[PDB]
Amino acid sequence: ALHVVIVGGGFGGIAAASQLQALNVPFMLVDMKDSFHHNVAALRASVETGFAKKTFISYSVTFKDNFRQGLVVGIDLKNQMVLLQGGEALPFSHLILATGSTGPFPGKFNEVSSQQAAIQAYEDMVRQVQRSRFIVVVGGGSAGVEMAAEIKTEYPEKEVTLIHSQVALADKELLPSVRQEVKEILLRKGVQLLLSERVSNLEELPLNEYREYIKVQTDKGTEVATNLVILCTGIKINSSAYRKAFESRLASSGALRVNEHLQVEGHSNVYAIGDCADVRTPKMAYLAGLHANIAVANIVNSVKQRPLQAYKPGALTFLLSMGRNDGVGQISGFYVGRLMVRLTKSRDLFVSTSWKTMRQSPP
């Protein structure tokens, strides 16, 4: 009578599934892929040979018969069933939606393929970077800011140009001191910055591939010759699993509206966690884990008739690695410097925590 189905095996998804498995609660983890992607380290995996294999963790090794690789094509609310591509249909007592977001490669990887192929896709990316003396990164958000730093740190000899449509880099919710230091760190590293300029000829450019000559154009008339184009232009909420069933309760972004208990609006046994939840905080893997703690607890609490926890977001903690040897950010809304970020994030990129959570050892 009690059985939880988790749609999405990302940071929030594996956190919910790791908890219920340790509690021996009957659950089912569903992901279209066979491996969890530690995408927080995906940019480093685009620049360091042999590193990508540490960013994919097989679901079945951890969850065994409690994991199901499948594409969720819909959710049957009346019969309380999750509908899979291929006909499989999973009954649930409670449902956690952890579908996350999609984005341009290499920052995100949301294709159904073999772990070997996924790893190879990043190794190919590394070879493209290594071949390119001139590299352009499009999008000066928190992602492309790290992408530019990673390349210039691993390959100081390369000419790296970051093109950003705004006057300042990284998220607007960050302290001005943090955003200014991100700019300064990139400048001290030798990165060329093109601020307040939007790349205007994107749809004609070859992506993630070395070329002898690529002509990059901006809306201000600037033209940048390059060997390689990398996109860090933003993400989109992945609503493919629930868009039809929860149409009326979606935010403008495709995320699901929720109360403080992270229950999806108009429901008591359906929860949304991570990027696909319409919380006002920045889309963070770290926050997806906190959402998962509240979700699994409130399922157990709703069953045990006990009180329900709530999501009260404190001051923003946000760390920007600036290559493996530098960094800047904030903790509870206060500036923190290189020594802090370098040991907390830049060095390992939280890779070891996912492997520890998944009860596996990286290859």
Ligand SMILES: Cc1cc2c(nc3c(=O)[nH]c(=O)nc-3n2C[C@H](O)[C@H](O)[C@H](O)COP(=O)(O)OP(=O)(O)OC[C@H]2O[C@@H](n3cnc4c(N)ncnc43)[C@H](O)[C@@H]2O)c(O)c1C
């Ligand atoms: C793009 C980017 C993001 C970063 C980065 N760095 C950090 C960081 O350092 N710290 C942090 O907290 N967040 C960071 N983030 C944000 C972080 O990546 C996201 O907030 C985090 O991935 C949110 O995780 P979720 O659990 O909410 O969702 P995921 O995208 O991780 O996974 C979703 C899963 O659902 C699955 N799924 C979706 N729809 C499905 C369907 N219909 N059927 C089956 N499976 C589906 C997908 O296969 C996927 O495995 C970064 O360097 C880059 C380049």
Ligand SMILES: NC(=O)c1ccc[n+]([C@@H]2O[C@H](COP(=O)([O-])OP(=O)(O)OC[C@H]3O[C@@H](n4cnc5c(N)ncnc54)[C@H](OP(=O)(O)O)[C@@H]3O)[C@@H](O)[C@H]2O)c1
């Ligand atoms: N925890 C972390 O350290 C961390 C690290 C990375 C990402 N994240 C999170 O993950 C999410 C995704 O971040 P993201 O940086 O990938 O995307 P993002 O935050 O949306 O930033 C992408 C930026 O690229 C710009 N852009 C888009 N198209 C462009 C073009 N053709 N030319 C020039 N600039 C262009 C956008 O500006 P316009 O909007 O003006 O087009 C936007 O500011 C964010 O919410 C972020 O909070 C967190």
Ligand SMILES: COc1ccc(N2CCN(Cc3cn4c(-c5ccc(Br)cc5)nnc4s3)CC2)cc1
């Ligand atoms: C010496 O005094 C102190 C020392 C340390 C602190 N802490 C440090 C960590 N944060 C939490 C954060 C987690 N994350 C992630 C992330 C992404 C994926 C995975 Br899997 C795991 C984590 N990305 N960014 C952040 S912040 C809270 C404050 C405060 C005071």
